[PDB]
From a paper:
Then, three C-terminal heptad repeats (CHR) fold antiparalelly onto the trimeric coiled coil of the N-terminal heptad repeats (NHR) to adopt a thermostable six-helix bundle (6-HB) structure, which drives the viral and cellular membranes merger eventually leading to the occurrence of fusion. Thus, we determined the crystal structures of HP23L and LP-11 bound to a target-mimic NHR peptide with the wild-type sequence or resistant mutations.
As a lipopeptide, LP-11 exhibited sharply increased binding stability and anti-HIV activity relative to its template HP23L. Thus, we determined its crystal structure in complex with an N-terminally extended NHR peptide, N44. Although the resolution of this structure was relatively low, we could build the most residues of LP-11/N44 in the electron density map except for eight overhung residues at the N-terminus of N44, which were not targeted by LP-11 thus their missing did little for inhibitor binding. As predicted, the C-terminal fatty acid group of LP-11 could not be observed due to the poor electron density map. The crystal structure of LP-11/N44 verified a typical 6-HB conformation, in which trimeric central N44-based coiled coils were bound by three inhibitor peptides in an antiparallel orientation, and they made a plenty of hydrophobic interactions similar to the 6-HB structure of HP23L/N36. However, two structures revealed the major differences in hydrophobic contacts. Second, Ile-134 of LP-11 failed to contact with Ala-47 while its Leu-135 failed to contact with Ile-48 on N44 trimer, which were found possessing hydrophobic interactions in the HP23L/N36-based 6-HB structure. Surprisingly, there were exactly the same salt-bridges and hydrogen bonds in the two 6-HB structures. Importantly, the superimposing comparison demonstrated that the L-T hook structure in the 6-HB of LP-11/N44 was exactly identical to that of HP23L/N36, including its intra-helical hydrogen bond network and inter-helical hydrophobic interactions.
Author numbering:
A (entry chain F): 2 to 36
B (entry chain D), C (entry chain E): 1 to 36
D (entry chain G), E (entry chain I), F (entry chain H): 47 to 69
Write the structure that this text describes.
Amino acid sequence: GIVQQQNNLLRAIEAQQHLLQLTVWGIKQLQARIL
Amino acid sequence: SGIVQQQNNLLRAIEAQQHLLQLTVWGIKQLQARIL
Amino acid sequence: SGIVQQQNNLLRAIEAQQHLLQLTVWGIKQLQARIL
Amino acid sequence: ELTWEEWEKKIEEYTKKIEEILK
Amino acid sequence: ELTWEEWEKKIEEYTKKIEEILK
Amino acid sequence: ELTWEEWEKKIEEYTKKIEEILK
């Protein structure tokens, strides 16, 4: 039901925001060791 | 609160997350360019 | 049309976005393995 | 694995895929 | 076409934007 | 500071987390 599917969608985007935070972090490391 | 308002909200955070994804593919391409 | 359909679409978006993430993680891994 | 061309290829196809689903 | 400063500013802007929409 | 191992482990964690919310 849509309240449940929507809570799940919110938790997905949260976790995905953490993955993004991590890819940004790695990019920053790399770049600080080439630039 | 109501399911539609919250549905919009989830849409806006998803398009914002696509612009973050875009920005990271850009930085990758940049360091790809430096290196190789 | 309606919230069942806008929700199916939202699910497929997050699915595809998870693939983009897998790809940016992959590129980061390449870069980093050629600096570290 | 992958090439960097094919990576670019795949990034471009998932970006238009999302970009369609988002209109 | 970007600087790394401006990239960082855009990452920070969209992160606060999502982070508002999620609180 | 993170280590690259622990980064990889966090990526793997969140990927299976999303991947199980997507079932």
